[PDB]
Design a protein around this motif. Structure first.
Motif, PDB file in Angstrom:
ATOM      1  N   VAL A  75       0.884  -1.152   0.000  1.00 17.18           N
ATOM      2  CA  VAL A  75       0.000   0.000   0.000  1.00 17.18           C
ATOM      3  C   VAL A  75       0.926   1.207   0.000  1.00 17.18           C
ATOM      4  O   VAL A  75       1.290   1.728   1.064  1.00 17.18           O
ATOM      5  N   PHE A 101       7.026  10.050   3.808  1.00 14.79           N
ATOM      6  CA  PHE A 101       5.745  10.535   4.304  1.00 14.79           C
ATOM      7  C   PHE A 101       5.951  11.661   5.298  1.00 14.79           C
ATOM      8  O   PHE A 101       7.044  11.865   5.795  1.00 14.79           O
ATOM      9  N   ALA A 123       2.416   6.808  13.554  1.00 14.65           N
ATOM     10  CA  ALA A 123       1.038   6.648  13.107  1.00 14.65           C
ATOM     11  C   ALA A 123       0.033   7.361  14.019  1.00 14.65           C
ATOM     12  O   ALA A 123      -1.058   7.743  13.557  1.00 14.65           O
ATOM     13  N   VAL A 133       7.427   3.186   0.799  1.00 13.85           N
ATOM     14  CA  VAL A 133       7.829   4.153   1.821  1.00 13.85           C
ATOM     15  C   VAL A 133       8.653   3.531   2.964  1.00 13.85           C
ATOM     16  O   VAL A 133       9.796   3.927   3.185  1.00 13.85           O
ATOM     17  N   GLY A 151       1.557   1.417  13.352  1.00 14.83           N
ATOM     18  CA  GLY A 151       0.183   1.772  13.617  1.00 14.83           C
ATOM     19  C   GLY A 151      -0.740   1.635  12.411  1.00 14.83           C
ATOM     20  O   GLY A 151      -1.962   1.444  12.579  1.00 14.83           O
ATOM     21  N   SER A 189      -4.888   0.364  11.786  1.00 16.88           N
ATOM     22  CA  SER A 189      -5.888   1.201  11.110  1.00 16.88           C
ATOM     23  C   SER A 189      -6.608   0.499   9.970  1.00 16.88           C
ATOM     24  O   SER A 189      -7.847   0.608   9.798  1.00 16.88           O
ATOM     25  N   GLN A 215     -12.027  -0.927   7.612  1.00 17.50           N
ATOM     26  CA  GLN A 215     -12.973  -1.647   6.729  1.00 17.50           C
ATOM     27  C   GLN A 215     -14.287  -1.969   7.387  1.00 17.50           C
ATOM     28  O   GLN A 215     -15.282  -2.145   6.683  1.00 17.50           O
TER      29      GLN A 215
HETATM   30  C1  HDD Z   1      -2.659   5.273  10.994  1.00 12.76           C
HETATM   31  C2  HDD Z   1      -3.306   5.815   9.981  1.00 12.76           C
HETATM   32  C3  HDD Z   1      -2.568   5.790   8.658  1.00 12.76           C
HETATM   33  C4  HDD Z   1      -1.333   6.227   8.299  1.00 12.76           C
HETATM   34  C5  HDD Z   1      -0.196   6.724   9.198  1.00 12.76           C
HETATM   35  C6  HDD Z   1      -1.236   5.959   6.880  1.00 12.76           C
HETATM   36  N1  HDD Z   1      -2.469   5.492   6.392  1.00 12.76           N
HETATM   37 FE1  HDD Z   1      -2.897   5.215   4.487  1.00 12.76          FE
HETATM   38  N2  HDD Z   1      -4.892   4.731   4.999  1.00 12.76           N
HETATM   39  C7  HDD Z   1      -5.317   4.646   6.320  1.00 12.76           C
HETATM   40  C8  HDD Z   1      -4.593   4.932   7.450  1.00 12.76           C
HETATM   41  C9  HDD Z   1      -3.293   5.379   7.480  1.00 12.76           C
HETATM   42  C10 HDD Z   1      -6.716   4.177   6.382  1.00 12.76           C
HETATM   43  C11 HDD Z   1      -7.636   5.152   7.186  1.00 12.76           C
HETATM   44  O1  HDD Z   1      -6.730   2.891   7.064  1.00 12.76           O
HETATM   45  C12 HDD Z   1      -7.098   4.010   4.886  1.00 12.76           C
HETATM   46  C13 HDD Z   1      -8.356   4.740   4.323  1.00 12.76           C
HETATM   47  C14 HDD Z   1      -9.020   3.670   3.484  1.00 12.76           C
HETATM   48  C15 HDD Z   1      -8.311   2.400   3.801  1.00 12.76           C
HETATM   49  O2  HDD Z   1      -8.653   1.284   3.411  1.00 12.76           O
HETATM   50  O3  HDD Z   1      -7.267   2.650   4.634  1.00 12.76           O
HETATM   51  C16 HDD Z   1      -5.882   4.351   4.130  1.00 12.76           C
HETATM   52  C17 HDD Z   1      -5.739   4.398   2.784  1.00 12.76           C
HETATM   53  C18 HDD Z   1      -4.552   4.487   2.067  1.00 12.76           C
HETATM   54  C19 HDD Z   1      -4.410   4.270   0.659  1.00 12.76           C
HETATM   55  C20 HDD Z   1      -5.582   3.988  -0.294  1.00 12.76           C
HETATM   56  C21 HDD Z   1      -5.721   2.501  -0.670  1.00 12.76           C
HETATM   57  C22 HDD Z   1      -6.794   2.386  -1.694  1.00 12.76           C
HETATM   58  O4  HDD Z   1      -6.539   2.808  -2.860  1.00 12.76           O
HETATM   59  O5  HDD Z   1      -7.952   1.915  -1.355  1.00 12.76           O
HETATM   60  C23 HDD Z   1      -3.094   4.364   0.317  1.00 12.76           C
HETATM   61  C24 HDD Z   1      -2.445   4.234  -1.068  1.00 12.76           C
HETATM   62  C25 HDD Z   1      -2.389   4.680   1.530  1.00 12.76           C
HETATM   63  N3  HDD Z   1      -3.317   4.763   2.562  1.00 12.76           N
HETATM   64  C26 HDD Z   1      -1.032   4.851   1.590  1.00 12.76           C
HETATM   65  C27 HDD Z   1      -0.383   5.211   2.719  1.00 12.76           C
HETATM   66  C28 HDD Z   1       1.036   5.506   2.805  1.00 12.76           C
HETATM   67  C29 HDD Z   1       2.078   5.099   1.771  1.00 12.76           C
HETATM   68  C30 HDD Z   1       1.302   5.783   4.112  1.00 12.76           C
HETATM   69  C31 HDD Z   1       2.658   6.134   4.766  1.00 12.76           C
HETATM   70  C32 HDD Z   1       3.797   5.545   4.436  1.00 12.76           C
HETATM   71  C33 HDD Z   1       0.016   5.885   4.787  1.00 12.76           C
HETATM   72  N4  HDD Z   1      -0.974   5.518   3.926  1.00 12.76           N
HETATM   73  C34 HDD Z   1      -0.114   6.156   6.132  1.00 12.76           C
END
Ligand code: HDD
Ligand code: HDD
Ligand code: HDD
Ligand SMILES: *[C@@H]1O[C@H](CO[C@@H]2O[C@H](CO)[C@@H](O)[C@H](O)[C@H]2NC(C)=O)[C@@H](O)[C@H](O)[C@H]1NC(C)=O
Ligand SMILES: *[C@@H]1O[C@H](CO)[C@@H](O)[C@H](O)[C@H]1NC(C)=O
Ligand SMILES: *[C@@H]1O[C@H](CO)[C@@H](O)[C@H](O)[C@H]1NC(C)=O
Ligand SMILES: *[C@@H]1O[C@H](CO)[C@@H](O)[C@H](O)[C@H]1NC(C)=O
Ligand SMILES: *[C@@H]1O[C@H](CO)[C@@H](O)[C@H](O)[C@H]1NC(C)=O
Ligand SMILES: *[C@@H]1O[C@H](CO)[C@@H](O)[C@H](O)[C@H]1NC(C)=O
Ligand SMILES: *[C@@H]1O[C@H](CO)[C@@H](O)[C@H](O)[C@H]1NC(C)=O
Ligand SMILES: [Ca+2]
Ligand SMILES: [Ca+2]
Ligand SMILES: [Ca+2]
Ligand SMILES: [Ca+2]
Ligand SMILES: [Ca+2]
Ligand SMILES: [O]
Ligand SMILES: [O]
Ligand SMILES: [O]
Lengths: 688, 688, 230
Positions: A134, A141, A146, A209, A345, A349, A354
């Motif tokens: 992902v 970043f 997190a 990352v 972290g 998440s 989900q």
């Molecule tokens: C602790 C919270 C947290 C942190 C620090 C990050 N993310 Fe995130 N991210 C989430 C919490 C989250 C989430 C809230 O869990 C999401 C929203 C939808 C999902 O499925 O996960 C998400 C979605 C999400 C998606 C969309 C996936 C899709 O297309 O459905 C991507 C590409 C990333 N993240 C990438 C990253 C990158 C590369 C990070 C740092 C290196 C990052 N995120 C840090």
């Protein structure tokens, strides 16, 4: 497609039915007489409207705006001396994939071409489980733990009182946060360089990352950075062009991907790893657990593992793209985590969130989330349980089911396992590692490595953005932080926003570089899917005929010619009314169209005698040509079409402006040269 | 079984995996050292516990406690001149079925043998859509308008402050409602007769309750009542025996059905209809739209349409039984609704409530809810979308999908249609129909038609229940209403509960009857699944041997002999400790076991010198025999076993008490005669 | 403002707390040593991230993109001979209001200035119950039966395969529906005139669209169209 086709509903030449297979009609409510009230017993009405009323699901909390495609991975080798991962176990081994690209901050329906970090999420449907990387299109970043994610995202997203502004960092809170939390600076520079406004999802790279572990069957590890090296080439916009694209086509990048796949122009990336040893965590002068740091390729080269090709669009966007639920916890034997507090972290998440999206626990049962490998466990029930477990004794250890399902671990059953030499030591604490404290040297590394124009693009982005910050305290705090990166950067930004030029602070200044790190400076590798707008006239049919001629000369490189004219006459693709410079990677005036490009066309009074067209806004043809030039695009003119360049005060003596006799190979060669360059940087002023 | 088998998970001799197919182990959390804290990165722990944490779904708002079985329907005719319903289109035509039986008031863990109305919900997976007849074991319902449902159910269910009492009407609010809303009285009498406490789900009938329409392809209608006529025979408990069963085996009736099917003793019911004309709605002295009214079989006989057999238990209770979502709105071409205001509002409730249970709109996609007929429509999306629609143009009328899916109506595509001669007339109003106002004549019909013992059972139920009503006003109001049914009923009940004997109020008194309407008074049609408990002793091996001998003489009628003894020796089925009269339809003392039945056995002091058994409570064997006798069961004794009858003051001269020389055919014939009678009503006192 | 103020949380000059009032810090995860793995027992981390993870709710199925404001209604008369509605019972009578303006087709991040019909939804918090007039800036609607709503909206919203185009009728399905279902033509002309692209929510009128009844205490009725004259 074998797997997903089992869930396809084909509605060609069929009768309408309810969701329980009763044939129905659905166009008139049941009423008490011809002009009567609707009856409650109309179940057809209620089932139809209930489905409608409940269509929506929560958008993703971040990366809400995005677009997906199916594809395949091919391993280049038997990587078993590096990793036990099954999908990497043999040269030529193939694994299905699904990939979703995205922005971060904007909601559903926000413009593709907002400035932002972009998501680059890749699922491998391996024969030993789903494996998701992902990633994003930027290798670093904003934050180092997190637990800070809600702080970053609440600051970037719209104000809490009025929900302004959409999909933008150009507001007080964002910059408050950036200046209060200077870890953010490295990603900030990437995003405010060309990487925040890419031309398409095919013209970016991807990055995992975090540092991860690869682990062999005998427990030996390497630390790695994951890379997706794009085979089309980096290409990005300038800000004013990205804004204009947001207004004309909110779907510009999603449409580019969809159309390229439909055309058979399948974009590709090579999967790579920077391979490092466990002992390398601090030796480079920064911590490998710190997600704000890159490993320059000068220090550790990218070892190429295999290739991804995206080659099939979804059949139903909601079912496949909206519902895909990526997780870094979707890990397979042969890969493991590191103690990067941001990764740590994330793991929590993405499992939790989900539940919000799907409304229950059985989200892995959605077709797009299911594995292409057997499922056998003692998990049970939950809303939306689509399977029927035959084992009535859902526990271990059991005798009642003969000890099955059986435990799988490092030695039996090809189980996942944590790299066995990992250790923990020290007091339990909530602290920021002292190894994470240099927030400025790598931003400076990035800045040093950019061509002059792209340095300017960062300055001009920051000037635009901070001029929208109302707080003088925030503006000053931003400059103080930028100055720790570079006094030149800080000074250049400060001058637009009423902040005193800062005195240098040499603490983190240095002159090191890393190669080709910006979005600008290299020729494209492939021209596939780029567009040439041919501006023609229905009053000169020969001008329209040049489209097909030019197209024949450009087809071999995957470039399309779009014929633009006043109305939809034969062989016209778009009308001037429907067209804009931002649709076209190159704009060419056709021979005979020059009469549409008069310098008085913007302001002439459209009296009945004026000859002013009602088929498009005043000045539209010339506006398209001038916008193409000012945005840095390849511009051309055929034959007497060159008179239009004179009307627009565009000299063919300028770089990226081409003339030719006719639409044959000589001219096509020059347009190909222009497209390979992509943007003509000498059209942008630079600070002195 | 072919259809559901596609969703089976076989977990024989396989390795454990995650829900995305990664092999795993799941017995130890990942810790920081041997005695360390658990790590957040343990995705195995969290996916396992998250599934666990989210296993539960809301219980059904009513009928929460229930049991399901698969089966088949076979039509006995081509019924096309009566109805267009496809499942009735030909003699021999088979349709798969799923049926759920239930109580009403209790939550999902409450006792099977609570006194209540019972649900009898039958789904036909027809080739033109799912058709559900969501019925009960009683033909009349408490209330006349669906809008009253929350009033009835809030009154019957536990008090709002303390959630007492569970699965019971024996409290002030329930009887407050019954007395305030005398429409309730018909169903109340049914439920307080034997129909409230049936022996098994196989020993009840079912009813659709409402009048429905059957409609031919050319629009002709009949009014009908649906019936499920059971082929085993009505059999019911007395209250005290239902209570004891609740304490000893809360799953008694669920267990009975599961076991009978595993034994191949498949229960059957014939589907029937009382066929009436449109002009009959107000001809019979009551309104066919009133669900508190039966049509006596003397006025309109039941025409038999075909047969349901239940013949397969679920593989996973949760996935199949808990998640089945019945709806009266699951109707097919050939059937239509009537203006019964109870039915009318049910239609809304059962579509709406599945949103609560499922947590989203796609509940018809659960395997158990799917049709066995094609689905094609323009409904889209929703959480938990399991299908992938290929048509991107999900609207009518369309040309982009060539006008598909196509409308289906009366004349093309076998569409559902409302019976076309139905009309509305009159002012829009919220009123109770004057045709609904006789709440008492039909309860008196029912009362008149019972054998004296079952009248006494109603009296004794109401005395038990209303003695638990604290409010004097409520008690008096109940007696006033009962007295409008029958002064005899009212007087008999009043005398237990401190209410003055009422003077006759004769407006609705009459002497009419309808045949065989109670639960008591006919011999059983089949003895399948009934149980004889043979009370034996390990100290007299020949007593235990009588089990197999008796079994041989009873197998041919589907009756099982269960050998009870002190401990699990060879050929013993149950211990005394584990046994109770309520397990057995007949109880027999084996020759040689009489020594266990001493009259001093309840109270003997169990000292070191006494020879009291530690293998069961003091007096257990004699308790089983005495309870069996007092409850009305067949009782017997073999040889000297008759000494136990003497100890218990049970004379063989009494009806339903049988002595035999040995365990041969003669004695087996007496036991079959007793089982057929089922309960010996001369053991219950009757008012004078 | 008195009513809603009871639910306000003022976070000026206070210490951070959990959602159950325990004072906390929320900037570093709990780790096994300075560079260690994050611990499951870190309830502060998990409550913070769980709230984050669950912030979103489904956008409205239509009119997802919109903006709200509080206000007040003042009656100009005693309208009791026309209607029993209490909020209209006296000259000068004030009732609190909340109003939301919107587009129709776009999701919640789409541009304000998409061409579309606009919603104009006004709630009166009356002393005899909430009364909502859920209207639009155009007095006529595309279709004549509510059962057609999913047809209209599926045709106008993005294509099912690729979810293109956002907040726009400029695609085949929309115009396929308009031409197949010519009831649509009146609203179409309104929306393709200036009413589709207003300068601001303050520079439009509103309409209830449907005919409603007003009813006096003695049961007498009039048929009415509701208007909001800007
Ligand atoms: C602790 C919270 C947290 C942190 C620090 C990050 N993310 Fe995130 N991210 C989430 C919490 C989250 C989430 C809230 O869990 C999401 C929203 C939808 C999902 O499925 O996960 C998400 C979605 C999400 C998606 C969309 C996936 C899709 O297309 O459905 C991507 C590409 C990333 N993240 C990438 C990253 C990158 C590369 C990070 C740092 C290196 C990052 N995120 C840090
Ligand atoms: C307007 C409310 C209402 C009314 C008047 C009734 N029901 Fe009901 N019933 C429901 C509202 C409801 C429900 C709340 O919608 C349930 C709960 C679970 C479900 O799926 O539907 C239900 C469940 C339910 C079940 C359980 C089905 C299963 O096994 O899953 C049966 C057998 C009945 N009902 C039968 C009846 C009968 C024969 C009625 C009168 C003739 C009746 N109900 C009136
Ligand atoms: C049968 C379906 C249906 C039909 C025919 C209409 N609507 Fe609608 N409308 C809905 C179903 C719906 C809805 C799906 O129920 C929404 C989505 C969010 C909500 O609360 O209701 C909604 C929202 C919604 C909103 C947004 C309210 C807000 O700001 O939260 C407005 C202003 C309207 N509608 C206006 C209208 C007008 C003036 C209509 C025709 C005269 C119309 N709708 C027909
Ligand atoms: C059932 O459906 C058909 C639909 O037939 C259409 O009818 C109209 C009027 O004749 C005509 O314009 C269409 O071309 C017809 N054909 C199709 C395939 O659309 C109606 O004709 C019937 O009247 C309907 N009604 C009944 C009672 O069956
Ligand atoms: C792995 O390493 C051993 C020793 O270097 C070598 O023999 C073998 O070729 C390697 N395996 C692969 C798959 O390259
Ligand atoms: C792995 O599991 C096997 C089989 O259950 C077990 O017997 C073996 O000891 C385990 N080994 C390890 C590495 O824990
Ligand atoms: C470049 O980086 C190396 C690596 O730490 C450092 O020692 C050196 O001083 C740097 N040189 C310049 C020009 O900054
Ligand atoms: C239906 O009715 C007609 C006339 O009574 C007759 O021809 C036929 O026997 C009947 N058909 C069936 C299916 O019984
Ligand atoms: C009782 O039944 C008789 C049938 O002989 C009928 O005529 C009469 O109306 C019925 N009376 C009542 C009160 O139900
Ligand atoms: C209502 O009507 C009556 C008769 O026209 C009249 O007495 C009175 O003025 C009216 N009242 C109001 C509230 O205007
Ligand atoms: Ca830390
Ligand atoms: Ca040039
Ligand atoms: Ca009524
Ligand atoms: Ca007892
Ligand atoms: Ca006898
Ligand atoms: O993210
Ligand atoms: O029910
Ligand atoms: O709407």
């Amino acid at each position: 497609q074998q797997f997903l086709s089992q869930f396809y509903l084909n509605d060609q030449d069929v009768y309408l039915t309810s969701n329980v297979g009763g044939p129905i009609q659905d166009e008139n409510s049941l009423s008490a007489g011809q002009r009567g009230a609707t009856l409650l017993q109309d179940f057809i009405f209620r089932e139809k409207i209930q489905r409608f009323d409940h269509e929506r699901v929560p958008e993703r909390a971040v990366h809400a705006r995005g677009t997906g495609a199916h594809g395949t991975f091919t391993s280049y080798g038997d990587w078993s001396n590096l990793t036990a991962a099954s999908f990497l176990s043999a040269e030529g081994k193939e694994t299905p994939m699904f990939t979703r690209f995205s922005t971060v901050a904007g909601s559903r329906g926000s413009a593709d071409t907002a400035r932002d970090v972009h998501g680059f999420a890749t699922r491998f449907y391996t024969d030993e489980g789903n494996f998701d990387i992902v990633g994003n299109n930027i290798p670093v970043f904003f934050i180092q733990d997190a637990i800070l994610f809600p702080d970053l995202i609440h600051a970037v997203k719209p104000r809490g009182d009025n929900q302004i502004p959409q999909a933008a960092t150009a507001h007080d809170s964002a910059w408050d946060f950036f200046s209060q939390q200077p870890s953010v600076l490295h990603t900030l520079l990437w995003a405010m360089a060309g990487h925040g406004i890419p031309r398409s999802f095919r013209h970016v790279n991807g990055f995992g990352v975090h540092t991860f572990r690869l682990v062999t069957d005998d427990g030996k590890t390497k630390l790695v950075k994951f890379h997706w090296k794009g085979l089309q080439g980096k290409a990005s916009f300038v800000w004013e062009e990205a804004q204009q694209t947001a207004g004309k086509n909110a779907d510009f990048m999603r449409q580019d991907l969809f159309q390229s796949i439909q055309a058979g122009r399948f974009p590709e990336w090579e999967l790579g790893v920077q391979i490092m040893q466990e002992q390398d965590q601090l030796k480079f002068g920064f911590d490998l657990l710190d997600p704000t740091k890159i490993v320059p390729e000068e220090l550790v080269p990218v070892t190429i593992l295999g290739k991804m090709q995206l080659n099939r669009n979804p059949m139903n966007y909601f079912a496949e793209t909206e519902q895909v639920m990526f997780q870094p916890g979707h890990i397979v034997r042969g890969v493991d985590f590191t103690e990067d507090p941001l990764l740590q972290g994330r793991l929590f998440s993405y499992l939790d969130t989900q539940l919000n999206r799907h409304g229950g626990p059985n989200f892995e049962q959605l077709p797009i989330n299911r594995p292409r490998a057997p499922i056998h466990n003692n998990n049970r029930d939950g809303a939306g349980q689509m399977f029927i477990p035959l084992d009535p004794n859902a526990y271990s250890p059991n005798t009642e089911n003969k000890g099955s399902p059986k435990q799988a671990n490092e030695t039996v059953g090809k189980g996942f396992f944590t790299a066995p030499e990992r250790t923990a030591s020290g007091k339990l604490q909530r602290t920021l590692s002292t190894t994470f404290e240099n927030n400025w040297s790598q931003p400076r590394l990035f800045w040093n490595s950019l061509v002059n124009a792209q340095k300017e693009f960062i300055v001009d982005a920051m000037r635009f953005e901070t001029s929208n910050v109302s707080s003088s305290v925030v503006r000053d705090d931003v400059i103080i932080q930028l100055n720790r990166i570079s006094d030149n950067l800080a000074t250049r930004v400060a001058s637009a926003i009423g902040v005193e030029a800062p005195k240098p602070n040499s603490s983190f200044y240095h002159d090191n570089t890393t190669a080709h790190i910006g979005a600008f400076g290299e020729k494209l590798a492939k021209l596939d899917g780029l567009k040439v707008g041919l501006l023609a006239s229905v009053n000169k049919p020969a001008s329209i005929a040049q489209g097909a001629k030019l197209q024949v000369a450009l087809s071999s490189v995957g470039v399309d010619v779009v014929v633009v004219a006043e109305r939809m006459a034969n062989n016209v693709d778009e009308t001037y009314s429907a067209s804009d410079a931002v649709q076209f990677d190159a704009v060419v005036v056709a021979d005979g169209a020059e009469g549409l490009f008069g310098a008085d066309s913007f302001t002439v009074e459209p009296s009945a005698g004026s000859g002013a067209s009602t088929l498009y806004p005043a000045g539209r043809p010339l506006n398209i040509l001038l916008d193409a030039f000012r945005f840095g695009k390849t511009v051309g003119a055929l034959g007497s079409g060159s008179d239009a360049l004179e009307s627009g005060q565009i000299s063919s003596e300028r770089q990226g402006v081409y003339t030719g006799k006719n639409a044959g190979d000589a001219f096509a060669k020059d347009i190909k040269s222009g497209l390979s360059t992509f943007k003509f940087l000498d059209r942008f002023a630079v600070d002195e």
